Symmetry: C2
Subunit: 420 residues, 2 copies
C-alpha cells in the first residue's frame, strides 16, 4: 500500500504557542477532532524552547509531559504526530532561553555546552515521545538556519562544515529504525549563497527533505499573485531539492505550505491551495503536504505581520474556512493516488567541489535557473533539476527519465527574492 | 507601635524562578513555613515577564493567578508579600518576552506600545493582588535600570527626563492609599555618572527608597572582605539616599542585602550579616531589611556565577544555614527596637540644577565622598550625607542633627567600582 500524507501545522486555537504556559486540554481534543474531520492523517507540533529548557541543565519535565500529552491526543483522534524540538523561531518571533541571550549570549551551533544541552533535551524528549504509538519522529527545530546568518540581528555565526557535524550529532539521538529524524531550513538554504546551511545537507542529512514553500519570498510579487510561477513554487522547490539528493528515492516532505495574504487575496486562497497541490503532486518523490496552519492566530495578539493571523484552515473561533474545504478536497483526491512518473527535461545546475551550487542565487525567484525551470514547466516538459555531475551520468538520467538537458548559459541572481 | 521589618527575597526551593513553569504548591507552603519560623514578617516575590505577558497584548491570566496564589500562601503562613512586576533581570539572566527582542527589539522605557502594555500588566496584576490581605504593594521590577545603559549588550537607551515620566506613569497604576508603589535600581543609580536613573528619582519617586547592597561591587575587593568599609556598605547607601530625599521621613528599604562568596568566605557570612545589620540600623530611616535570598540555588542549574548558588539562608535541601540563624537573631534584636536618632556630621555632595551629584562616581567604592564618609563612620561621628543645597539650610540641618559639615575638596572617582 502506497499513499501521500496530508496534515497540518498545529497552531493551538487557545493561546497559539502560548498554549504551553496554560494548557487547555479539552481545547486540544476539540482542535484535533476538527482537524481529523478534514481527513488529515498527521499534525506537526511545536513546543517552545525556553519552557522546555529554561536553564541549560534544568529540563522542565512537565513541559516534556505536555508535549507527550499533545501527541497522545492526536493519536486518540486518529492521527500521527511529528514534533519539532527547538523553537527557536515561530512566525517572526524568536524564543530563546535566557542562557543563550545578552549577558549569556551563546552560539547554539558552535558552543560545546549548548550542543551538549541540545542533545540532552532531544534525548529526554525523544525517550518520552517514543513511548507514544502516534509519534512518528522529530525535526530538530523550525527553520533554525535563520539564526545562523545575516540579516539576523543577533546571529550565531557558523560554517557549513560545522553544521554538517552539528546536524549529524543531533540526528543521531533518534533511533531511525523506529522514527524519522529530520532538519528544517527556510528557503535561504536553496536561495542564499554562502549560507552555512546547504542544499546538500537538506537533501541528504535526515530521513526526508523538508521544504517550506512561501510565495511572499518574491515569487508572487515578481510574477504576480495569479501567475503560474506562484502556484508552481512548491513543486519547484521539491524538484530543486532532488538535484542534490544522492538517494533517488528520498522522500520530499512539503512540511509547510500556506496562502499568505500579504501577497494573495483572501478570495484566491482556495484556488491557490488546489493549484499548488496539484502541481506539487507532479513530483514523483512528494511524500506529504502539511498546510501552514490549522488555526488562525487570535486577533487579540499583536506584533504579528498581519497576514499571519489569517493563515489557518479554521478561523479563530474554530470554524472551517473555504481554504480548509479545499485542502480536505485535495487530501481526498491525492492521498491514495499513484505517485507521478518520470521527468523528460532537466535544467543543469553547476556545482562546486562539495556538490552545492556555484550560484544559489540563480535558483531563487527572478534567477536564471528559476526562470528556465518555470518556462519548461509552462511548456509541459515536466522539468526537474540536476547537477552538472548528474548531467554527465547517463544511468542517473535514465533513472529520472530525463532525455533533454538545458544549461544556464548566462546566470543571474534572484532579483525578486532580494527585492523582498 | 513602631517596628523594623525583616524578610527574605524568596527564591523557590523547587525550581528557582523556573518554578513558575511547573508550580509545586506544597513546596511553597513548606518554604514559607520555614521562612516564617525564622521570625520573618514578609517576602519579596518575583514572577517572570515572558510567562506573564508572552505577547504584548496576551496576558497569561493563569500566571497572574499563580502570583496571587504565592501571595496567598505567604499570608496563610503569617507574612506580608511584596511583588516585583517585571523580571526582567535575575541573577545575571535577562528574561524578556519575545516581542521585545531581536526581530522585535524594542525599548521598554520609550516605546508607547510597550509602555501601554506594561501599564496594562501592572493594572491586571495589581487588581488581582489587591484582593489578598497579605499583599502590601509592588516594585515595578528588579533593577530595571540595568537595561538602560552600558554595558548592557542590547540596551534600551533613554534619558533621565523620560525615566521621570515612565516611573510616574507606571507608579500611578497603584492606589497608594492602600498599597506601596516602588521602583528598584542596582547601585548604578548611586555610583554611575550620566546614568538615566538618578538619585533624585530613587529617593523621591515611589513610597520608599529601595537599596540593593552588594559588596562585590569593589568594596570588599578594595578595602578587604574583613574591613569595616565592607560591613558599612549598606548603612552608607542608606545615608547616601537620604541626601536626595526631599521628605526627611522617607523610609529606606534595604530591599536586598546578601553575603556574596565571590568576595567573602563562607565561614564569615554569619558575622558579615550581623555586623552589616547592626550598622544599617544606625540609619534612623531604615524601614526594613530583606535578605538575598531565602534558598540556595539548586546545584543542578548551570551558568550562574558560582557564588549565586550559596546566597541562601537555607541550603538547596531546605535546611537552615548558619547565616539563617544569624539573620533570625538580628530580626529578634531589631524588629521592635526604637529607631536610631540623629547624625552629628555630614559629607557635602555638590549637586547640579536637578539635585543630582555633579560627580556620582565620587560616591562609589574608592571615591572621595565614599572614603570621607567611611572615615567619619570609623571615628564614630555618625555621619550622614547632604547636598550642597541642604548644607546651606540651617533648619534642615537642625532636623537631621548635623552640627559639622565636611566638603569634598579634591574629588575623585570610584576606583574600586570601575576596577570591577
Amino acid at each position: 500500500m502506497m499513499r501521500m500524507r496530508f496534515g497540518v501545522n498545529y497552531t493551538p486555537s487557545h493561546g497559539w504557542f502560548h498554549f504551553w504556559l496554560d494548557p487547555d486540554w479539552p481545547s486540544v481534543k476539540e482542535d484535533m477532532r476538527r482537524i481529523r474531520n478534514l481527513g488529515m492523517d498527521h499534525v506537526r507540533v511545536f513546543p517552545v524552547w525556553p519552557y522546555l529548557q529554561p536553564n541549560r541543565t534544568w529540563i522542565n519535565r512537565k513541559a516534556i509531559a505536555d508535549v507527550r500529552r499533545m501527541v497522545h491526543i492526536a493519536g486518540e483522534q486518529g492521527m500521527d504526530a511529528y514534533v519539532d524540538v527547538f523553537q527557536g523561531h515561530l512566525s517572526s518571533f524568536d524564543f530563546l532561553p535566557s542562557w543563550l541571550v545578552t549577558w549569556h549570549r551563546g552560539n547554539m551551533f558552535e558552543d560545546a555546552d549548548a550542543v551538549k544541552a541540545e542533545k540532552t533535551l532531544v534525548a529526554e524528549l525523544y525517550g518520552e515521545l517514543a513511548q507514544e504509538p502516534a509519534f512518528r519522529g522529530l525535526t530538530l527545530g523550525n527553520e533554525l538556519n535563520q539564526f545562523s546568518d545575516r540579516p539576523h540581528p543577533a546571529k550565531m555565526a557558523t560554517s557549513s562544515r560545522r553544521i554538517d557535524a552539528w546536524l549529524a550529532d543531533l540526528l543521531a539521538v533518534v533511533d531511525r529504525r523506529k522514527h524519522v529524524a529530520l532538519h528544517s531550513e527556510n528557503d535561504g538554504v536553496w536561495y542564499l549563497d554562502h549560507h552555512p546551511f546547504t542544499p546538500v545537507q537538506a537533501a541528504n542529512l535526515g530521513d526526508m527533505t523538508t521544504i517550506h514553500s512561501w510565495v511572499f519570498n518574491g515569487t508572487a510579487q515578481g510574477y504576480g499573485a495569479m501567475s503560474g510561477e506562484c502556484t508552481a513554487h512548491a513543486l519547484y522547490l521539491a524538484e530543486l531539492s532532488r538535484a542534490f539528493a544522492r538517494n533517488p528515492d528520498r522522500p520530499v516532505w512539503l512540511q509547510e505550505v500556506g496562502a499568505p495574504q500579504n501577497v494573495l487575496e483572501a478570495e484566491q486562497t482556495p484556488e491557490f491551495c488546489r493549484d499548488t497541490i496539484a502541481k506539487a503532486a507532479q513530483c514523483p518523490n512528494l511524500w506529504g503536504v502539511t498546510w501552514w496552519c490549522s488555526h488562525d492566530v487570535d486577533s487579540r495578539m499583536s506584533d504579528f505581520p498581519p497576514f499571519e493571523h489569517a493563515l489557518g484552515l479554521f478561523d479563530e473561533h474554530g470554524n472551517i474556512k473555504p481554504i480548509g474545504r479545499a485542502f480536505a478536497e485535495m487530501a481526498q483526491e491525492y492521498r491514495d493516488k499513484p505517485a507521478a512518473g518520470g521527468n523528460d527535461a532537466a535544467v543543469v545546475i553547476e556545482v562546486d567541489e562539495n556538490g552545492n551550487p556555484l550560484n544559489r542565487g540563480a535558483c531563487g525567484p527572478g534567477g536564471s535557473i528559476f526562470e528556465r525551470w518555470m518556462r519548461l514547466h509552462a511548456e509541459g516538459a515536466r522539468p526537474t533539476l540536476v547537477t552538472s555531475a548528474t548531467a554527465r551520468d547517463g544511468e542517473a538520467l535514465r533513472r529520472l527519465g530525463v532525455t533533454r538537458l538545458e544549461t544556464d548559459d548566462e546566470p543571474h541572481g534572484a532579483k525578486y527574492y532580494t527585492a523582498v
